[PDB]
């Protein structure tokens, strides 16, 4: 999964920011959210979010669906490392398992079930 965010921000700057944000907000996790390449649904205006550790994937889906005005017939999937995370998983659990060495979790979203 290629994240444009990494082109825009060198590793050491990301890592320094991620270390600091975890100390300031230990009950939240820092996330980079990007639309998967070629997905035909709406765009966010930011990539970097700071979400509650106890927020579930399902709650995040609900918020994105309403934020980008998805229709009922529109699908919405997340991918972490090209795999759909469980809807019941919390962000904190996904962070523990999948955070990168810059201390961020990376999530792609799409209207398709394959990244």
């Amino acid at each position: 999964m290629k994240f444009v965010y990494k082109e825009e921000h060198p590793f050491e700057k990301r890592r320094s920011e991620g270390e600091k944000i975890r100390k300031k907000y230990p009950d939240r996790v820092p996330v980079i959210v990007e639309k998967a390449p070629k997905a035909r649904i709406g765009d966010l205006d930011k990539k970097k979010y700071l979400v509650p550790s106890d927020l579930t994937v399902g709650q995040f889906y609900f918020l994105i669906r309403k934020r980008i005005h998805l229709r009922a017939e529109d699908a919405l999937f997340f991918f972490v490392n090209n795999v759909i995370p469980p809807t019941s998983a919390t962000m904190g659990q996904l962070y523990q398992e999948h955070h990168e060495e810059d201390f961020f979790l990376y999530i792609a979203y799409s209207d398709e079930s394959v990244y």
């Binding site: 930011k46 979010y49 700071l50 509650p52 709650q59 918020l63 934020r67």
Partner: peptide
Amino acid sequence: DAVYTWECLAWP
């Protein structure tokens, strides 16, 4: 809900 809103997720 009253806590888990879109703005809740915003980077500070």
